Design a binder for this molecule. Sequence first.
Ligand code: HEM
Ligand code: CL
Ligand code: CL
Lengths: 500, 500, 500, 500
Amino acid sequence: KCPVTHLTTDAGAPVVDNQNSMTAGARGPLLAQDLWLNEKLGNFVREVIPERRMHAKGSGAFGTFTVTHDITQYTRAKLFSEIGKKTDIFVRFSTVAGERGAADAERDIRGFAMKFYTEEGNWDLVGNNTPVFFLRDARKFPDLNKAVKRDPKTNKRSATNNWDFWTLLPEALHQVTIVMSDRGIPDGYRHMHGFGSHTFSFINANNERFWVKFHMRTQQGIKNLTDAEAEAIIAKDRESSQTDLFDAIERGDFPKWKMYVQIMPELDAEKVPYHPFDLTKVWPKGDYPLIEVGEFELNRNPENYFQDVEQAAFAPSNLVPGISFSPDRMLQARLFNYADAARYRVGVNHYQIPVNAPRCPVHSNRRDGQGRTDGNYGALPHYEPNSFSQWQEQPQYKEPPLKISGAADFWDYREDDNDYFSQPRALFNLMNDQQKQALFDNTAAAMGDALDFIKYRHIRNCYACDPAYGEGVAKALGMTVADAQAARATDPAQGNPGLL
Amino acid sequence: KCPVTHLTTDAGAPVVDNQNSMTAGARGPLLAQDLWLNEKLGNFVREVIPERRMHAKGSGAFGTFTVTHDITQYTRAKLFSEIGKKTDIFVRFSTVAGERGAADAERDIRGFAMKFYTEEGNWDLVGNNTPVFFLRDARKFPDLNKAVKRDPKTNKRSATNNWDFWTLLPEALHQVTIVMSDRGIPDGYRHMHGFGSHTFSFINANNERFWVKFHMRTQQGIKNLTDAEAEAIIAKDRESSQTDLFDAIERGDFPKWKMYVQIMPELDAEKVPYHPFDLTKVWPKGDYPLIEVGEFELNRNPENYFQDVEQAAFAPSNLVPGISFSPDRMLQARLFNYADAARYRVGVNHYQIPVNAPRCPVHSNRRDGQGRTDGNYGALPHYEPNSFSQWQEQPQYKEPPLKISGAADFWDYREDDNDYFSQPRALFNLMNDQQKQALFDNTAAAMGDALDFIKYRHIRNCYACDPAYGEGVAKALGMTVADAQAARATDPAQGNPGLL
Amino acid sequence: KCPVTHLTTDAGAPVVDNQNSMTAGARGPLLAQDLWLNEKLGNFVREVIPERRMHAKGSGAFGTFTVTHDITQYTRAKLFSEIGKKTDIFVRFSTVAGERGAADAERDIRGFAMKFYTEEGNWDLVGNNTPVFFLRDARKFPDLNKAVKRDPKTNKRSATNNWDFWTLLPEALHQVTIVMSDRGIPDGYRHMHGFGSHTFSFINANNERFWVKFHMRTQQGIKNLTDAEAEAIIAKDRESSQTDLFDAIERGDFPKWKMYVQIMPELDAEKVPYHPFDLTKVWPKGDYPLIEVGEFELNRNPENYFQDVEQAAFAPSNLVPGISFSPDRMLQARLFNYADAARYRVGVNHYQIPVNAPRCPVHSNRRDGQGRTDGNYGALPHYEPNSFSQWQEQPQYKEPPLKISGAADFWDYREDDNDYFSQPRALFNLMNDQQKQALFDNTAAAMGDALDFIKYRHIRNCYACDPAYGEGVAKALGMTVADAQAARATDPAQGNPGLL
Amino acid sequence: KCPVTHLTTDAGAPVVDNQNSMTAGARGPLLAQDLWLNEKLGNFVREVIPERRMHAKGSGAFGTFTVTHDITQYTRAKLFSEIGKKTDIFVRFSTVAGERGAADAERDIRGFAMKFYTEEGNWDLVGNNTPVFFLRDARKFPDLNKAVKRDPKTNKRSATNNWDFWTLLPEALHQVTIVMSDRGIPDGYRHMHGFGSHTFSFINANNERFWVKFHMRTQQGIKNLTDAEAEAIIAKDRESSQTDLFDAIERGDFPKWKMYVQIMPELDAEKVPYHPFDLTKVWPKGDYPLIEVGEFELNRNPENYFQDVEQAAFAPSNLVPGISFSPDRMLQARLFNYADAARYRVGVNHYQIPVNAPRCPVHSNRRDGQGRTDGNYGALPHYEPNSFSQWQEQPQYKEPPLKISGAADFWDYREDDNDYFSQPRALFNLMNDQQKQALFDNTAAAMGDALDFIKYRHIRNCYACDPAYGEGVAKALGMTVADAQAARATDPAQGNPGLL
Ligand code: HEM
Ligand SMILES: [Cl-]
Ligand SMILES: [Cl-]
């Protein structure tokens, strides 16, 4: 609004008429020489890009992060180098299974994706509102996509597809318990925590490695919706979380999180009794307590949703000196899969998009590609080694070596670690009676019409985790643990390693 | 299900392990030589194509059309040539404003897109569940897209954007009245009519032209949902119309429509008192009664939604001998905009997709393009004229000339026809008291929080159509027609041709 | 060169090693966590975009245009408004049939594409080094593409495909004569003229229309290569024209053209004895003498060929107030085909590319699309009509109406005008004996191994144009006009309108 | 040719006129309702896909491979299982640096890409006409692309860019010597050998590993062109190798190669004095003599070049049971980079293209993607694990583990192996005096105008390889080894590990 604008073509030619097309007489046929119509409609049918293969529905905001505590003994990362140091951030929150138009207030994981515009590169912490995940090997990620999304023929969610998959992965019971708890539907993005979920690494100025987990704790408090409350909100508003977050920032009610880390010296990874790189497992806070780092707030709604939120590309591979990866098998796949997904979805030149662009010096020698806008590194020599001091590597940032034991092979995770249930059993025993009844009710509702052998399989897995959990679930499904047990002999998945 | 399948790569190499990735020791980093993971994940992030720029949410089915009546005196079209002749069809139903994930049971137009696999080409009748539309010049179609979709900043529907646009187009009141009536929310695709909406042409074996309108009348009966009933269905099911249609076909309860035509001899177009090519106007049935043609049923759910429904491309330009276009200015733009939209969305080689492919001989000499699969017309000479009898034109199908009067220019539609209100006034006076109260209630709900000057503008336009319509709307908005009238002097759109 | 650069990722993270990949031991397998390699190679395989479907091989330069003469009585175009007024330009020269790597010094038309960065929009004059073309209806343009390019099976140029097509278009003899003359191989882009070829329109401040032809005459002089001289240059340099033009600008030897116009009052188009919109015909200079307008020089080599030359998009539709189109049937197709070609080749957001961007105000309300970088018109309302003074049309630039006579139909060009030979006969009689012998020799060489019936057909067409032309061609082919004449009875194209 | 064809649209509608466009009167403007023109031209501008980022210029043929010898003790690969067993193949030959249009007879490596349509998957042996390459780590491959292709500003080959890069890689001297020898320009694809170049692996039925090198030896004899002979061929024909190969097959003169292998037991890789996975090094035939396997002939020209040759996608990752990879660092990158390059260039669904499609059972569960044609695995469950025997892994094909020693790190190749010159010195001493003089002449011609410090650097590296080689090169450049030696002190690349 405000300053009057006069319509032009892309090339800046004045548009004469924006109400009438050019015709051979007043009621005659349309002419090809109606240039503005050709341009207006040709561009119109190319506005849509592919949605994200996962986490398609989302809301974004800009904000800042402030260091409140010193952790420079563990990490040389420049954004953490001093108390008081402020870094600008972009955050996209999301659901997982919904397409672009889907309801915000579904029972699902939420995405918690953070981009930090640092002096030594953008650092993407691509997190979830849960410290764990259903899977611990990336082999299973495309299968999870199909299981939680639409059947190839009914084009609807399928409790049978979803729960057949989940119940054949006993390692999944931890995240299944979390998403079937009261926290499976947060009351908008401001009332949930975030997590890196994976084990990452810190590297200090001494070139020492630590293993690390990020926790982002909501200063607005954990707050949830029951199935019924969510359904009532969806009936009015499929965009309930966008409404909530946009409205909050618009009225100056900026949401805040505190950032903590669990820090584990490199050598401790071979001393702990739990697999320290297993995404289905946390590190107990009694072994590795939270160390406070800083605080971030979201304080600015983007001017244009498509340019800043839809085109936003996060990559776990977007790391900076002093923050690096781990051999978590899931993290390891994400280190390449996001950059690849973004080359397809927003283009090879997607770092030209302002929300993705670095706010520090950049010298990649990336050349050409569709839609090159930014100079294309001009006439500079485009190869290395060269005799012209172009594109010089920076060895001072080299990480210490990472010790390997064992041959290259497909190593059976089930031989390495098969503690599927101790962590979910702990979580069940933390719950009060209401939360337990919610867990049982939410579970039986989600299984809905899944085939009976699948309901029996979940009840068996849940009983193994804790007899009271198996009972509450079996009861809420109107079944018995005895029938669940009797069904194992004829379970059609017989012969299959995740079938216990 | 049924025959056991053994996992291979695209190239047919056996996959050894589909549960574990290849690692440097059991808890070591991931190896690049894990070929199956690279392939599985690289293909995974390229499954999604752009949604349709309009009518993104939809349901599809296969079926057949049977001629029941003789109209060969009006049309030489081969699918109509004999009573009893059966043609196979594909139909996609849709909403308009929803993205891929959006609720089915919104207040919106529904799409009614038909593909007839004819012996002289696929005939697409790309229709709506309404005989008219909001607009009569394609200039305004991209603007309607933005008005009924998401604000560029809030990323939500905007009553202000939507109703500012609508109230500045008095010609739109006809379709606004239809979509705000009880029929703005059909109880699924089986309980709505379809229409070509536009005036088309028939050409008979004598090379005579008729102007024609297609009506497809539901044999299951008009059936609707109130705002409250729709909201309750959405709370359970965003896919309510897919559920309804898929379930009906799956239980053998095949939905049927009867097809009729209004036929107008060419010369009558200059004798009627209404603009006969104006998409905001019908032809009164008293002047041009319905002539029965045939009956179609939908009787087969596609095996794969993506391959048959999501990749389906309709084009109003997909016409056959004996069925052709008119100078309707809206139809005229669609004659090029759909083929162009599909080149971007499903590729230049989209006619290789089975649902789009013709079931008759095809010799286009279309060469190359990404993903060419079908022979590419092999080694045949690829130019015309040639000395080799390749690609010979077919003059026997030539249409009679179309008379033009007037210069090429931007002809102001408002000078040519400005009867905005007589047809909506007729429709209002057909309604019984309940339907009228629904029209008023639905209208005030849809305007929701639109700025007051916009509510005043709709009330003025509605009063001009019929004093009782203006009153019922003003009342349901908690306003008065007097205030509406007083606001015209300061209306901020002053200086603007659609502001009456 | 000069300032030392330190290699980073796109996200600005330092790169540790640019010589060694990350491996599991010194002679072990490659790790997926080698982030720089993934990024470097993933981006590398996306550098290439599609070449132009026509005129793929080219050279570009920046320059300026200066008005030297007053023609404001004929055109209100702002770049021409005063003597001395300077406009910045980009020019791309090209061959036509060569792919990206093909030789510069082939016997072909050359492209002469001009972009003028004007205060009322970019004006593209997309010209050739010839005043005419082979065709006069766009129906035949894709066929010309196939005929002059590679056979679908041999993947080589085919004299049979090329000359079968050409000899079945008698209207083509004019351009065939030009491209087979000594001027079919200019000695680089600096020693050739340019032409708009088509009839365009001027509109003056009085809203009067003139028909207009643009001539751009080389101030370096017409200079050509024989077949033998060209072949010798190709043996050393496939990039001979890039070498020539780049080297000339680099040493300050800036090439200059003078711009002239032929001006014809609107009404004269119905008074001339030649079809004034027929691209196979010029306007004789005796009827419409050249009027001088200005002078342009190319004086700056682009810093980056891909960003400025390969991504350059010209469109005949890029017109400005006071310069517009004509009903030339070929021009009429180009008015839409280039903008469409560019949406595919450089993207819907290709006007963000600096060489394509306007240097004047732009308000198109074009939204979104892949790779949106420039603000996306932020939060401004995105529909018209609106109550907020956004996107207001500009009626002061409206053209006078264009008179139409006749029905909409496929009008046979051969019924309308069939003077195939008078203009080529004039051109043949302008030639001196050497140029004539060149025309005959060049023709027989180009026909090479074309089937005999095709050589006979060219000789017949050439004899009809002028008995001496038919003789010289028949002789250089080692045939006789008598045999050519005897072959017409059995010509396999019998039954075909371009077969005389 | 032969059967008369009648022109239709893609949808199979008859085309009335293919010579005239639809106009408002005979000399009037073009109408938008000319559907055939819209379709014909819209499809026309989408025929071109991106060329290959490397090896863009090529020729293809179909053929067969016959086993002549038993090697089943080394490999369980099914195509080798019996003497007499015939496998169908596709082969694409190429240059490396040329774009689509570039000359065939340039001084360059040639590509020798083989696809074997095997009963357990397509096996791609993506080879070159040389047993080695310039590089031994993939870090340097994009840099080699830029060095051997066009300068970002001159858009021409640059001897300075090319030789600056090459002379700073002493490991490159082996391949530099080969490509500067008489064999740098083979007399077409039929007179050159092929090689896998890399060390691969065989796995036998006992689950034992061997390291292996493939040699494909021409039965038509090594035959070459001098610089002068090549230049003379280019002056006539940029497509000389396509002409040669197509013509040979067309006249029944089918070219044949014999396939041999060098076989090295796994444990020998730690016993040899040369790095056995270093692409700049061969295995001496005295240590590992050639073992004969079979013979292949190319006997069928494809019907359509674009469908079969341009869309052909090879991937080193396309391996079958009994043939696998090695830790060669270059091979390791190609294992992912080709499948990724093809997803961009020919689409995610490129295995639908007949030349790429497997000729054995395929069950990948790859879903959707643009242009899905083939059923999309219909309604089958689309996740694993499932209770429905879909997508079952095949463990019988598991390879033995691969022993790793050392930490994950960037291991400096120059510390591991720095024998740059012994193999090129051997090759120089195999040459007769003519071949030596050719090597010197070809080298000085290729360095052309490269800056002097670069010529000095090549002479130094060549002298180190063999004093006679340094002398012959220095002399042919008109320089002395003494000046070369004196220049090292001021060499501008001082401080750089490949500068000796
Ligand atoms: C100039 C006015 C119009 C323009 C520019 C327009 C443009 C479009 C575009 C670009 C799509 C998506 C096409 C694709 O990607 O396959 C679409 C879909 C559709 N349109 Fe329109 N449209 C217009 C008017 C109408 C009218 C008046 C009706 C009904 C009479 C209509 C019915 C539909 C239907 C049913 C679909 C969905 C087709 C399907 O199921 O794939 N449209 N339109
Ligand atoms: Cl891609
Ligand atoms: Cl496109």
